[PDB]
Each structure stands twice: as structure tokens, then as C-alpha cells.
């Protein structure tokens, strides 16, 4: 079961025969050497990825797959807050429901249908054998079972310790194996005392066993459009990304413009930032939060552009109670925060910290 | 009752000043005016700002970060007042400082101090104050 | 047994060990009920004051309400809201005076009305419960004014507006019997009945003089609105009972709280709220002690409990503390609340046996006034 | 200390004590304790012109005097030398002898908050 | 021997006997002198508070001033006025917040200015004298703002108006050196010098870092504006003296309050106002006692006296009570004021010998701050 | 000598030969059967008195001489408040300075000058004997001495027990001979706890030995002009009685409209009231005080005319701090005060109380 299934998923993850022209695999955009994000330069920089056709750009930044297997399946909790799911807007329930979508997405891998997917699985004698042993004879001749089986293998593969190793410096410190530097510990202190702990921690209180620096909620933090990414996406200058409201089933206007709180793990190495890749620097992503609290002229200026942040793409449902903390992060706390975030880098991406 | 003696944390009564979590509490334990250990009493407004302290828990000998939070918008409760200062630093290290009315982020801009809750937000240590 | 703070420490330890999560938030007070008890703290004339909302069964403070200078608290008998008439000043105890009435939700304790009273019209006096009063339907709050002359203010709680001041004779206290009607007690030894409209000279009627100029009627008579029973001790523990349930005053027979031998041995009532009346039981509770005749505001250590119809003594409780005020829950097997201004502690007693059951301490600076809702 | 229920015993030797003979019907705080004096208001507070009376026995001269008390107003309660005596104190319907009332009327600037009380004599009693 | 109350009984009995008439009126407080002392009661975070004006020589309360929530008192060294930055809410502790400065006439105690601070900019904290400060010429008041970032507010007492906020770095406390200049203590362990023109940002210079990260400097340094002497103890009694008299920060030799031995046997400062500085005597007074390293806000029973120039201990006094706060008159043969929060009593000691002379009890609910004018 | 001087003044007091047409003595206006005030009717009722010429009316009501001898001479105390003197405006320093004034006042006894006065004294053989025995031979030949000696005699007579006997029920009650009725006792309690005591008691605190129910100060209580009296006196529709300001040597505009607080002794029998005799009934004078305190419309209506009290004759320097007590007298406290002020009637005038309402 677990072992072979995930090994099957490991094969598929790197196989471009699941893209129309056979030019891309999950690995192309979710590059294991880049914490499962997209190193490839496009029209919009690294803000969005380019599909298999060599021309179609997405409208959202490719997130890491690291730690994604810790996110609960999509649900409304008893306080009425939506939590969990996959994609920035939560529209997939879980990893398995998410896995099939890039395959058939025309701006991504662009297979026409589950059948063409199954045909490709059939050309590979190794898939014949691998799939049959886990799901039974003739699985690949049925495009439905073939596609679900693939998706399940991918999901299993993402749930292996290899995607969520908890071997960051932060994990070592919480095991008492290492200490934080002064600046890092200042960072952690600031992070858990300032508004960050209100969205980027699993729990309200108590100690989380496998912290992934996200409560899995949806929040509109009031980000502007990324002009060039939106340009390259071709979705139009009229378009509004409504975030969670775009998940089918969600009708509630209060969800407009809300996006899933990303895990902050590996954040230091999966630039650029936010759902649209608008901020290239992590320092910027952190500064953005000062727009709600600081009264200083500079707090309204994105330091990457020299210009005003931009009005929010969605100027409704902003999480003001959380963002308007009444306190401003000075340079020092921002430094400390960057320091602390860098400690959430998995061991194997420690060399990338440059 | 020797106020200068090292503080001896207990895990058996949250309304007493030597309760383990109140190790850097300043004011009034909310549990005495109609809140609880980690909830604000009615009519008050829970601040988002906090100060923190690593408090030692006698029971499991584990050290826990307590991110104290003020319930604001009422006159001080006058009940179960306490002041402890484990790890407490002066106001220029505000994250560990406890004279500050940590009412920021409270709804309605409430800034008056009523009482303090003591929830746990981490199992960690500090350089200046470890067990 | 296990105190409340010990029970809480155990439960938090169990949540910690179990990885139990929970959102820090604003509590709701539990639903008002018969054993809810409010203690108001006039704080010996401080400019700001506190009311403690107490679960009398657990002996737990379930909430608090802030007030200004010598507020008059009221508690709607049905438990739907609470209110006070309060007074603040722009610079603590100096500057522009604003009298106002707040109505509060009894579980969030949030104010749901804040009604300015024009021309700073409240009577500033050591707290008498019956100087501000709810009509029976909870729609109007009546407040006494002393200056420039005795008068009564009508506040519409439902429309959240002040209505008008009523001109009254030289009379005191306000016992509503109806949505438009109240009694006052007059200098001449009668009751005045005041029936009022939105405009017009109120209909003012006096009963006959029901006590001589030298029997002194205390500032804290018990009034049960649901019963229409006004229970009015004199300095000697002589108790006048007036029945106002017909809408007019019928004088009940006088009873003596104390025996002649007790009176000959210096027993007299004394304290603040010296008398309590249990409606369902038709029982009068009087704070009494041995005292000189002009020590009538001092605490007392004893409660006499007497049948209101016959004046037969049912109990003399030895309270065991310096009690200034008493009151009772209005449920069966009531609690007898015994408030020490000095100890700042509400002692909560079994009203049947008089035994102390539990107490709530740290109730302000100078707590004086106990109020319960009659919800049955 | 005192048996609070015992008959009040006047003295004429300490004005800050609750048994000072002129305080036989005082309610509140002695002004002498917050910067006033026996018959003056502390700085910053406002002198009421209302009063209430009592006949207070003066054990110095065997004479009973009328003491028409007067509040100093417009400050929070001083919190010093609190006292409450009620010799001849009558209920609120005989306000000329009733002492729970905040007797701050006539105070300048409409001051009506209670700070403390002074104990001047205004006549001989009969 | 004869108490102030007794002597008063006697002069009244005399006036009565002689038939001497006197007009009841509002007293003026005795002119400010060096022995006048102010005790501020932050009342354990009560929404309103009291300041006591005390004649230190007679141990007599000569007046009082009402304040709001955690107000910051300031006292003009020349005795010509007092002031505070205060905070009220339109409904006791809830609703619209007003921060304001009042300036008071120090004999009638009447407010002479009431200056609104826009945007509720005061830092709400347990009272630190040096969180609000008079510039030397008494014409400006500077107050600290924490939120949303450290800032300092400039209030013109002469034009009775607020001017503007100064943007400062990550620093705390405000020690005015001149009409346009103040120093602050910075998280990086430096002092920031702040010079504000009429407009522009201020010009901000930093001293060198003068203490490591793990040396903790107390929230209540002594500062003598007229000496320019900032005296800053750390938790171990290590005392930083900084001379700001030249306009720029000169660091004096660092001194030790407790012996290396004492520190080994658990001697550490502790209290609120742990340190006093007598300008003419150039002398540091420190509340210390034997205590765990993190019981630094507890009452202390002893005071050490040391030469500011050298560190030589001059006296060690067993205060005889739990003392939270000390300060000294700035006259010759000073009083040493030892305020007990727990006792709500100011103990007035001879600073030379440490003997207790007299005391003033009933100073509010949790008095903490002693101010004195330096009038010499 | 102090018996003889007084006895010589007793003679002058009742002697009409000290008025021009010989119709008028002090006793005419200061009538001993009416507590030394003027029973006679003039063009303005009893508000103001008619002179010896049969035509001239004064502009102020004739005050009792009872207890006048207890008033200190006029002076300014340390708090800058003027106190004492004689006349409603304190313009006489003392009784002796006042006494010669009615004599020469063309609106009163109207003698032309001191010499006409001396010439009259000389005509009477008993005066020659009486005066010469007290002041020496030839005293009556010197008009200055004769006049001053008469003033002195008149002052002394007014200082005798007969003018200030302290034998009122109030006096009797303060001795312990008797008690107040319940109304009187309540009246008394009100009088000393309410604002009256701030002006109508000798002292601010302690006990007066010979209480005459005035602190001898000057207060503008904001009374209107008495129109009929002001017509009768002929001073003009534009005339302002300035009170104390009219005393020569008082220049302070803050003294305009302030009048000497009268002694309330015999107030019950010496209506009408105030300096211009404007209110007829004792009750009314008391009711006037509610205009500063009551919020009832009637508080502003003079019950004797059914019309507003009127604009103050002098609208500035009103004793507002004392008058705006914040507490209105109900009719029970008004009845009480009437009964209490009736106790201030001298023994010999008690029978006069009978007619005036009751007693
Ligand atoms: C670039 C063309 C991509 C390829 C090829 C694949 N993915 Fe992807 N992924 C991409 C984007 C732009 C996004 C976000 C899109 C959005 O609408 O929000 C994603 C997202 C995921 C996620 C969710 C991660 C999270 O929400 O935290 C998962 C689990 C995921 N992708 C997995 C995945 C698999 C299994 C793929 C091969 C079939 C695959 N991706 C290809 C960009 C691209
Ligand atoms: C809820 C109101 C939040 C608070 C308060 C903070 N963060 Fe956040 N964060 C939040 C969301 C919903 C998102 C994604 C927003 C979007 O639409 O794209 C984020 C994103 C970040 C990132 C970018 C991570 C990534 O792109 O993969 C960083 C680095 C980040 N957040 C950090 C951060 C810090 C340091 C905060 C306290 C100052 C903080 N956040 C507050 C939700 C919320
Ligand atoms: C009527 C025409 C009078 C005759 C004759 C006398 N007096 Fe008189 N008296 C009269 C009036 C109208 C007034 C008040 C006038 C004013 O300007 O205020 C007075 C006043 C006095 C006083 C002062 C009393 C007081 O102020 O309380 C005294 C002492 C007095 N009068 C005495 C007096 C003597 C001694 C007389 C004969 C010489 C005499 N009066 C005549 C009206 C008339
Ligand atoms: C000073 C502010 C006073 C207060 C308070 C009271 N009285 Fe007075 N009274 C005062 C003056 C200055 C005068 C004379 C005013 C004038 O210009 O004529 C009076 C007069 C009276 C009278 C009439 C007496 C007479 O005409 O001989 C009465 C009956 C009287 N006053 C009574 C009175 C009462 C009952 C008061 C308390 C309600 C009271 N006065 C207050 C000065 C002042
Ligand atoms: Ca990214
Ligand atoms: Ca008259
Ligand atoms: Na949707
Ligand atoms: Na007339
Ligand atoms: Na003049």
C-alpha cells in the first residue's frame, strides 16, 4: 500500500508524458530543487508559471507542495470560518482531488481528457506493472480508474516524509537540539506576540505537534493585483480574483477576496510571494502588514516599486480586526521576523538561502 | 507570603497568584471577574497584543510560552489581583514587559485594563529566562 | 470541597495534556436565573463604581458592570435586562455632569441603550434601591429628584428617550405599581399615589397619615413589585406593611420584629438594607442587633425571620459577620444574602437554616446594595 | 476598636476622630483630613450652601449645639478619615436631619460630587 | 506629641469659648515649599485616580487632585505649577477616549489649562515618572507614545496647545535637557538625543551602546533635570550615571549599589521607584532587599545610600515597613520619602539617619509615585 | 447721666416741635405701638412715609428702630464686605449720625436748619433744664451743640432696653422657659439650614449672644422698583436707588443695588417689606426667594399682583451665589418660616400678631 503507492506517485510526479506535448511534469512547476515551486522565468518573472503549450501563463503563483499534506480537508468549522483544502482559493478538498486538475488544465499540463491521460499511462510498461499491482489488472484501460489511481499515487507521494520532513532549524530548536540566535529568537517572540500568530499558527493556544505556521483559514489581507502577472495570465484587466468565493459551493459574499493562509515553511526560498507572486522579496511581504498599522508615509509604499501598494483587488472582507493591531513593526522586528522565517527552511534547502 | 522569595509555581488553583501560568501576569486574573483562565469576562474586549513569558509547569516540568492577553474596556476588576514578573524585562523589551497596558487590537479601541488571561502558545525557552 | 479555582486548574491541566484547543474570546454570562444576585458598590461616594453580577448558587462572580457617581441599579424581575441611572462628569468628579440611563444585555452585559437625562436631574444620595424604579412591564424607569423640589423623572426604556419630570408633593421613594402609577412616602406621614400621563398635571392622591411624626420609617423598606407589598420598618423594628396590589394602599397590621424584652434589652434594627421580603414565603427578614437608638446604620449580626401575616418569629439567625444589608432569592429554598460593607463580602446563607453556605469576597470598596430578580 | 453598636461617646479633643463631638451626624470624610479644616473646604473643591443639622453634645461645656454640616464638592471622595454617625439622624423624608443625601447644593460650578464634610456650629440647641 | 487633630480640637474649642467668628470657605494650600510632596495613586489600574499633595514637614495632607486612567504627574521644579497628562472615557472605562493635559495652580489647585491631546496618543502603562516630562523652562510638556510606534508628543503649556508628534527610533523614556532637546533610552542599548526645531523631523543622534543585551535597566531611573543627572540602576543594582548637562551624553563611571558579596547572598533592588537622587548632596538612594532575581517589583525593607561620585555606601536603613517607592526632598537636611503601596502610607523619614519621623496613611488604593519639586 | 440722657431723648423722640409745622415727631413715623414703624397711609399705602409738610413722601419704607442699637457702626471688613451703619444704604455711620437727619430732611420733619432746631428747644423750659444738666449751660444757644446733643439723646434713648427687649417667644424658647410649637420648630430648623441663615444671622458660625437676625451686610437681592412708592416719592421714572453706592464715599460699582440686611426681629408686625415697602405680606417676602431657586412658573409671579416680580431695579451684583441655593421652599416650609418669624415678635407686640393672619 503506502510504500509502493507513493513510489508510483514518485514516478508520475516527474513524468512529462502527462502533459499534452510531453514537455511538463508536476516537477517542472513544482521543482523539488526549489522547495516544489517554479524556478522558470516567464513573461511575469517568477510570479506565475507557463503551461505545457510554452505560452499559457497562470494567474497565481505556484505554491510549494512541502507540508501541504498537513492541511486538513476543506471544511466550515463551528465558528463559521472555512479551513483547509488545496489551492490558494481552497477549491480542491484535499491533495487527491487537487492532483488531477493540473493534468487537464489547458493553461498547465493540458491533457484533453482522462482518456488521453490513461493512454499515456499505457505506453509505459513500467506503469502497466506499477498500477496493476496496487489497483488491479486493467486499471489503465479504464480512464476513470486510471486518473483517480494516478491522483491517489500523487497524493500519497506528497504525504511522504520527504515533502514534510520537519527538519528545519526551527524544528531542531523545538526539539532542544539547537538554539535560536538572538535575532531568530527575537523574531520568534515577535512572531508569536504580534498579529502574525493570529493566522500563521495552527492553534489558538496549546502546543501544536506538527506546526506548519498556518491556521488553514481564509483571509483577505487586502493585496493589490500583480499587473504583469495579470497581464500574462490573459484573464483581462477587468478580471477580479475573488479567492475562496471562487470555490464552487461557496456563495457567501463575506468570502470574496479571501485566500488560504499559506504555510510559512520554506517561505524564505519560495519567492515571489502571495497568491499572485506580487512581492519578490520576503522582507516586502512582511512590510506589507505595516500598511495597516504604521502611520509613516513609507508604510503605504511598496519598497520594490517605489509606488503606492495599489488598492486591494478586493476592498471588502479585509481582516481588519487582525491586521489593525495598533502596532508597527520597526526595521528591527522586520529583520528579526526575516531571521525567524529563515529558520523554517527544510534542511535540504538550507543551501538555497541566498 | 514571603513576597521576595523565589516564586513557587503550583498547578492546582488558577485564582491564586502562584498559579504556574501567572508567572508574568500583572493586574487581575480574569477568572475572578467572570472570565476564565483563557477567556475574557462579558462586556470586555479581548486585546490582540500580548506579552509573553516562558512559565515553568511543575506538573510535567515542561516550560511553556504564555502569551498574556488583556481584556479591556472595564475598570479594573479589583478581584484576585496578582503581580508576578518571571522573565519580565523592562519596557524597552516590551515583549517581555508587563506594566504596559497590552490593550492594543481590542475592539472599540478599548484601552482600559480589567483583567488578564494566561493562555499557552508554545513550548519554548528564552536566553534571558530558561529553565 | 474543591474550590472553583482548584476545579479550573484541574480542567486546564487535562486540556493541556489532551492537546485540547479552544479560542480565547469574550464569555457570555450564564443565563440570568433565580440565584443571580447583583451587588452594587457605591464605594463610599466614589465618583466611579461597580456592580458585581454573581451566581449565588456557585458563589461566583459571573460579570461586572461599571458605573458613575452613586448609580441607582435596577434589575428587571423577569431577567430580560438590567439598567442603572448613573452620573459622570467630564473631568472625573468635576466639570459637565451627564446623567444617563444604561440598559444592558444580561448575558453579554453590553449596553443596549444609553439615554441622556437632561439638566442633570438625578438625586445624588447614598444608594436607596427605591429611589429609582422599573415599572412592572419594564418599559419605564422612574427616578427621584430632590432638587430644586421633590420630583420624579420618567424614562422610556423602550423608545430609549427621557420623557419628563413630574411635580410631586414633599415625598420620597418611588414604588411603581403599574405602567403609569407609583407611590411615594410623604413628610406628613401619608403615602402619595402618583398616576401620570405623557403630559398633564399627574393625578396625586394621599392616603391617611399611617404613622406618628416620631416613628421613623427607614430609608430601605423592601418592596415586592409582583406582590405589591411595601414592608417598612421603623427604627424600633416595628414593621408597617402596606398592600398596594389593589392599586390603592391598604394598611396591614403592624408587627414587631423584636419582643418587648428584646426591645427593653436594647435590640433594634440597623444597617443599610435592613429588611428583605420573600414573596412566595410571605416572610420578612430583619437585620437586628443590640444597639443604642442612634446607631441605626451600623451593621447587625443577627437576622430575625418572621411570618408577615402574624408577626410570629420563625428564626433568629446568628449571621456570624457584620452584616449591613440583606436580601433573598425569590425561588423556593431561597438564599439569604448577607452583605458586609466592611468585609466587602457577600455571605450567602441558606435562608431556612441560616447556615452560611459560601461567600464572595473582594466586592469593591464599600458594597451596600443587593438586588435579585423576582423571576417566578 | 469601638463596639460600633455602642452609644456614641462624644469627645472634644481630636477633630480627626469619628467620635469628635461635632461629628455626631457626619456622613463621609472629615475635611480636615484632605486639606480642609473643621469648618473649611480643601483647595480645589467647592463649598455647598445646603446643610443638614444635628444637635451635638459638647462634653467640654455641657451644652448641646446645632451643627449645620456642609459638603465640599467637585472632588472624588477623599478616602481619608471616613466616618458615619447618626445622632438624631432622621430618614430622608426629614431631609433637614438626613445624612445620606449629597448636600452639595449651592456649591460653585454646580459641583455635586462628594469630597468631604465640615462641622461648623450655627446655634445653641434646646 | 499633640497631633494635628488634637491641636485642631483645641483651637476650635478656644474659638467657641472666645466667641470668635470665622467664615467657612475654601482654603488655599500653603505655598509650595521644598518639603511639599506629591503622592500619585495609579490605584492598581483603576479608571480614576488621585494625587495627594502633602506637607512633608507636618506630615499633613494639604490637598488633592483627581486624575483619570494611569495619568502621568509632573511637577515644575520651581514650584510655580503642577500638571498631568491624563485620560478619561465618556463612560467610566469604556467609550470615547480623551487624553489631555491639565496644568494646576499649586495653591488653589484649580486647573489653569486643560489641553486636549489629539488621537488619544498617551502611552498607557504603570506609572513611569519619566514617561512624561517638563522641559526645563516649564513651557513644554513632552509625553511618550508607544503605539503604533515609539513617538514623542510635544505640548505647549504656554500657548496651551498640542503641536505635533516626533518620530523617534525604538526608544523609551523622555529626559528633557533643554527647551528643544530630550534624551531617550533605546532598545539597542544606546541613548537617543532628540532635538526638535519648530518643524521638520527632529535630528536624532545616538550615543554608543552603553550596556549589553542581558543587563536590564529599570523602568524608574532617577533624573534630576537641574543636574542633568540620569541615574539608572539595573536589576543587580549596577547603576549607570549619565551626565546630560553639557547638552550631550557624558557617561560617568559605572557604580555598584550592593557589594559583590551581597549580590552573592541575594541582595537586589526591587520596588517601583527604586531609586532617588539628591542633587545638592550628589547622593543615590536605592530600595534593596534579599529577593529572587525575578521578584524585582516587590516591596523592599531597606534603603542603601551611596556617593554618586565614588559608589561608597553612606548608610543602610531598615525602613521598618514594606517600601515600594522612595524619593527625597531636594532641600538641605532632606526628607526621605518611603511609600508603601501595600500600607497606602507615606512614611516620612530623616534622610540622614533613616529614622521614621511621621507618616500619612490612607493615600488611596495603591499609591506608587512620589514627586517632589527641586526648588533650590 | 445714662438714665437722664436717655430720658431726655425719650422726650425729644415724641416731640412734634422738632418738625417745621410741628406736626411730626420721630414717634410719628417710628410709632412705638407699631414696633417703631409707620402705621399711617400715604399715596403709596404703607410703603413710604409722609413728611411734616403733609405732601412729601420718602422713597424707602420706614424701618423699625427696635434692635437698631445692636448694629455695628458702618465699616468694611477684611473680606472687603461692607457691614453695619444706619439707613437701608448704610449712609449714616451709627444712630447718633442718623438722628439729626430726619430733622432737617425737607421730606421728613423739614426743619430749615440747626438754628431753627435749637430755637425750638429753647422755647421749652424742661429742655433748657434737661439739656443744660447733661451738656452744660447755654448748650441750647449754640445750634451746633444743641443739634448734636439732641442727636446724642436720641441715640441713647434708642439704645435702651425698651427698644431691644429680647423678650420674644424665640428669646423665651432659647432660655428654656418654653418651647416652639411644631411649626415654629420646623420653621427654625429650615431657617438655619437653608440660605436664610447665610444673611439673616449675626454670625457665620458659633452662637450670637444677642441675635438680631442679620449679619449687617449689604446684598442686592434683585428687587424691582416699587412703582407706586417711586411715583409718590417723585424721584423720577429714570431714577435708580443704588443702595450702598449712594453712601457718600462708596464708589465701587459692585455696591450698586445692595441694601443693609434688615433685622428680622418684629418682621411680623412691620410690613410692608424690603427697602421700598414693595411687598405687603410677610409670606410674599419669603416667596420672593423662590424666584432664584424654583423651576415652577409661579416662582416668578408676585402673588400680590399676579404679575412677574419685575426686572431688578439694579440688575448687577445680585447675591446669586447665596440666592441660587438649588432648593425651592415648598408651602409647608414657607408656613414654617412665617411661624418661626412670628416668634421674633417682642412681647408687647404679640397682640398685634392676632390680626396679621394669625400668630
Ligand atoms: C505549472 C504549469 C504547474 C504544474 C505543471 C503543476 N502545478 Fe501544481 N500548482 C500550480 C499553481 C499555479 C498552483 C496554484 C493554483 C491556484 O489556483 O491556487 C498550484 C497548486 C498546487 C497544489 C495546492 C498547493 C497549496 O494550495 O498549498 C497542489 C497540491 C499541486 N499544485 C500539485 C500538483 C501536482 C500533483 C501536479 C502534477 C499532476 C502539479 N501540481 C502540476 C502550478 C503547477
Ligand atoms: C490574517 C489576518 C493574517 C495576519 C494577521 C498575518 N498574515 Fe501573513 N498571510 C496571510 C494570508 C491570507 C496570506 C496569503 C495572502 C494572499 O492572498 O496571497 C499571507 C501571506 C504571508 C506571506 C507570504 C507567504 C507565501 O507567499 O508563501 C508571508 C511571508 C506572511 N504572510 C507573513 C506574516 C507575518 C510575518 C505577519 C505578522 C507581521 C503576518 N503574516 C500576519 C494571513 C495573515
Ligand atoms: C417719616 C417722615 C419719619 C420721621 C419723622 C423719622 N423717620 Fe427715621 N426713618 C424713616 C425712613 C423712611 C427711613 C429709611 C430711609 C433710608 O434712607 O434708608 C428711616 C430710618 C431711620 C433709622 C435707621 C434704621 C435702620 O437703618 O435700620 C433710624 C435709626 C431712624 N430712622 C431714627 C429716627 C429718629 C431718631 C427720628 C426723629 C429725629 C426719626 N427717625 C424720624 C422715616 C422717618
Ligand atoms: C442675602 C443673599 C440674603 C439671603 C440668602 C436672604 N436674605 Fe432676606 N433679606 C436680605 C436683604 C438684603 C434684605 C433687604 C432687601 C432690600 O433691599 O429691601 C432682606 C429682607 C428680608 C425680609 C423683609 C424684612 C424687612 O423688610 O424688614 C424678610 C422677611 C426676609 N428677608 C427673609 C428671608 C428668608 C426667610 C430667607 C431664606 C429663604 C432670606 N431672607 C434669605 C438678605 C438675604
Ligand atoms: Ca511563492
Ligand atoms: Ca417695613
Ligand atoms: Na463560489
Ligand atoms: Na406699590
Ligand atoms: Na457713593
Task: Give an overview in words.
Chain F: It is found in: Periplasm. The complex is a heterohexamer, with 2 copies of chain A, 2 copies of chain B and 2 copies of chain C (376 residues). Chain A has 354 residues and is mainly α. Chain A has 12 helices and 4 strands. In chain A, helix 1 (2-13) crosses helix 6 (143-158), helix 3 packs across helix 6 (143-158) and helix 8 crosses helix 12. Chain B has strands at residues 26-28, 45-46, 51-57, 62-72, 81-83, 113-117, 120-122. Helix content of chain B is 0%, strand content 26%. In chain B, strands 2, 3, 4, 6 and 7 form a 5-stranded antiparallel sheet that branches. A two-stranded antiparallel sheet of chain B has the order 1-5. Chain B is mostly beta strands and 131 residues long. Chain B has one domain (1-131): Methylamine/Aralkylamine dehydrogenase light chain (Electron Transport Ethylamine Dehydrogenase), CATH 2.60.30. Chain C contains 2 helices and 30 strands. In chain C, strands 16, 17, 18, 19 and 20 form a 5-stranded antiparallel sheet that branches. The B-E interface holds B 3-7, 26-27, 73-76, 78, 81, 83-94, 97, 99-101, 103-104, 108-114, 127-129 and E 43-47, 69-70, 87, 89, 92-94, 97, 120, 124-126, 128, 146-147, 170-173, 185-187, 214, 216-219, 270, 289-292, 294-299, 322. The structure holds heme C (4 copies), calcium ion (2 copies) and sodium ion (NA) (3 copies). One sodium ion binds next to loops of chain A.
Amino acid at each position: 500500500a503506502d510504500d509502493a503507492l507513493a513510489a508510483l506517485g514518485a514516478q508520475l510526479f516527474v513524468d512529462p508524458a502527462l502533459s499534452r506535448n510531453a514537455t511538463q511534469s508536476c516537477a517542472t512547476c513544482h521543482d523539488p530543487a526549489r522547495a516544489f515551486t517554479d524556478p522558470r522565468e516567464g513573461k511575469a518573472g517568477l510570479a506565475v508559471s507557463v503551461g505545457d503549450d510554452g505560452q499559457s501563463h497562470g494567474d497565481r503563483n505556484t505554491p510549494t507542495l512541502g507540508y501541504a499534506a498537513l492541511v486538513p480537508a476543506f471544511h466550515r468549522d463551528a465558528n463559521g470560518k472555512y479551513k483547509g483544502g488545496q489551492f490558494w482559493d481552497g477549491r480542491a478538498d484535499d491533495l487527491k482531488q487537487q492532483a488531477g486538475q493540473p493534468m487537464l488544465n489547458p493553461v498547465e499540463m493540458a491533457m484533453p481528457d482522462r482518456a488521453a491521460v490513461a493512454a499515456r499511462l499505457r505506453d509505459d510498461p513500467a506503469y502497466r506493472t506499477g498500477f496493476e499491482a496496487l489497483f488491479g489488472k486493467g486499471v489503465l484501460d479504464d480512464p476513470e480508474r486510471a486518473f483517480d489511481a494516478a491522483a491517489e499515487a500523487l497524493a500519497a507521494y506528497q504525504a511522504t516524509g520527504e515533502f514534510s520532513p520537519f527538519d528545519s532549524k526551527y524544528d531542531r530548536v523545538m526539539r532542544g537540539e539547537e538554539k535560536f540566535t538572538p535575532l531568530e529568537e527575537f523574531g520568534y517572540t515577535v512572531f508569536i506576540t504580534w498579529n502574525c500568530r493570529l493566522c500563521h499558527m495552527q492553534r489558538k493556544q496549546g502546543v501544536a505537534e506538527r506546526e506548519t505556521f498556518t491556521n488553514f483559514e481564509y483571509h483577505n489581507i487586502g493585496l493589490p493585483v500583480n499587473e504583469t502577472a495579470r497581464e500574462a495570465s490573459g484573464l483581462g484587466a477587468d478580471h477580479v480574483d475573488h479567492g475562496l468565493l471562487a470555490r464552487p459551493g461557496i456563495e457567501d459574499p463575506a468570502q470574496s477576496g479571501r485566500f488560504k493562509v499559506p504555510s510559512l515553511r520554506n517561505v524564505a526560498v519560495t519567492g515571489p510571494y502571495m497568491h499572485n507572486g506580487v512581492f519578490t522579496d520576503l522582507r516586502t511581504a512582511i512590510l506589507f502588514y505595516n500598511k495597516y498599522t504604521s502611520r509613516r508615509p513609507e508604510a503605504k509604499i511598496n519598497p520594490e516599486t517605489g509606488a503606492p501598494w495599489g488598492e486591494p483587488e478586493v476592498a471588502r472582507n479585509l481582516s481588519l480586526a487582525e491586521l489593525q493591531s495598533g502596532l508597527m513593526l520597526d526595521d528591527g522586528r522586520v529583520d528579526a521576523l526575516v531571521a525567524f522565517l529563515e529558520t523554517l527552511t527544510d534542511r535540504r534547502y538550507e543551501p538555497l538561502l541566498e | 507570603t514571603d513576597p521576595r522569595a523565589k516564586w513557587v509555581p503550583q498547578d492546582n488553583d488558577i485564582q491564586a497568584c502562584d498559579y504556574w501560568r501567572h508567572c508574568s501576569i500583572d493586574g487581575n486574573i480574569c477568572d475572578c471577574s467572570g472570565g476564565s483562565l483563557t477567556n475574557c469576562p462579558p462586556g470586555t474586549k479581548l486585546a490582540t497584543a500580548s506579552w509573553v513569558a516562558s512559565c515553568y509547569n511543575p506538573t510535567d516540568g515542561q516550560s511553556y510560552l504564555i502569551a498574556y492577553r488583556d481584556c479591556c474596556g472595564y475598570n479594573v476588576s479589583g478581584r484576585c489581583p496578582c503581580l508576578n514578573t518571571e522573565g519580565e524585562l523592562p519596557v524597552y523589551r516590551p515583549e517581555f514587559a508587563n506594566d504596559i497596558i497590552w490593550c492594543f487590537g481590542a475592539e472599540d479601541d478599548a484601552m482600559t485594563y480589567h483583567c488578564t488571561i494566561s493562555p499557552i502558545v508554545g513550548k519554548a525557552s528564552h536566553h534571558h529566562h530558561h529553565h | 470541597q474543591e474550590t472553583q479555582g482548584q476545579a479550573a486548574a484541574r480542567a486546564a491541566a487535562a486540556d493541556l495534556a489532551a492537546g485540547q484547543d479552544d479560542e480565547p474570546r469574550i464569555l457570555e454570562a450564564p443565563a440570568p436565573d433565580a440565584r443571580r444576585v447583583y451587588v452594587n458598590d457605591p464605594a463610599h461616594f466614589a465618583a466611579v463604581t461597580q456592580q458585581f453580577v454573581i451566581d449565588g448558587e456557585a458563589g461566583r462572580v459571573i460579570g461586572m458592570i461599571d458605573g458613575g457617581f452613586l448609580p441607582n441599579p435596577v434589575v428587571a424581575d423577569d431577567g430580560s435586562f438590567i439598567a442603572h441611572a448613573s452620573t459622570v462628569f467630564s473631568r472625573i468628579a468635576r466639570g459637565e455632569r451627564t446623567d444617563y440611563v444604561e440598559v444592558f444585555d444580561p448575558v453579554t452585559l453590553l449596553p443596549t441603550a444609553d439615554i441622556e437625562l437632561p439638566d442633570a436631574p438625578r438625586f445624588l444620595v447614598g444608594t436607596y434601591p427605591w429611589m429609582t424604579s422599573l415599572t412592572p412591564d419594564g418599559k419605564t424607569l422612574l427616578f427621584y429628584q430632590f432638587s430644586p423640589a421633590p420630583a420624579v423623572g420618567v424614562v422610556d426604556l423602550e423608545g430609549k428617550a427621557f420623557k419628563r419630570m413630574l411635580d410631586v408633593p414633599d415625598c420620597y421613594h418611588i414604588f411603581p405599581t403599574a405602567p403609569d402609577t407609583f407611590f411615594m412616602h410623604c413628610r406628613d406621614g401619608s403615602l402619595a399615589k402618583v398616576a401620570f400621563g405623557t403630559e398633564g398635571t399627574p393625578e396625586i392622591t394621599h392616603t391617611e397619615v399611617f404613622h406618628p411624626e416620631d416613628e421613623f420609617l427607614i430609608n430601605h423598606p423592601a418592596y415586592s413589585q409582583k406582590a405589591g407589598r411595601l414592608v417598612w420598618p421603623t427604627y424600633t423594628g416595628k414593621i408597617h406593611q402596606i398592600d398596594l396590589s389593589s392599586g390603592d394602599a391598604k394598611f396591614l397590621p403592624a408587627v414587631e420584629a423584636l419582643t418587648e424584652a428584646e426591645r427593653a434589652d436594647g435590640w433594634r434594627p440597623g444597617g443599610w438594607q435592613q429588611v428583605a421580603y420573600h414573596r412566595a414565603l410571605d416572610r420578612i427578614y430583619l437585620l437586628v442587633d443590640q444597639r443604642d437608638e442612634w446607631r441605626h446604620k451600623t451593621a447587625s449580626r443577627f437576622v430575625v425571620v418572621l411570618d408577615a401575616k402574624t408577626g410570629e418569629r420563625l428564626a433568629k439567625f446568628e449571621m456570624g459577620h457584620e452584616i449591613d444589608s440583606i436580601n433573598v432569592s425569590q425561588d423556593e429554598k431561597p438564599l439569604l444574602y448577607a452583605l458586609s460593607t466592611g468585609d466587602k463580602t457577600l455571605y450567602i446563607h441558606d435562608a431556612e437554616s441560616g447556615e452560611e453556605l459560601r461567600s464572595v469576597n473582594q466586592l469593591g470598596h464599600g458594597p451596600q446594595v443587593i438586588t435579585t430578580a423576582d423571576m417566578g
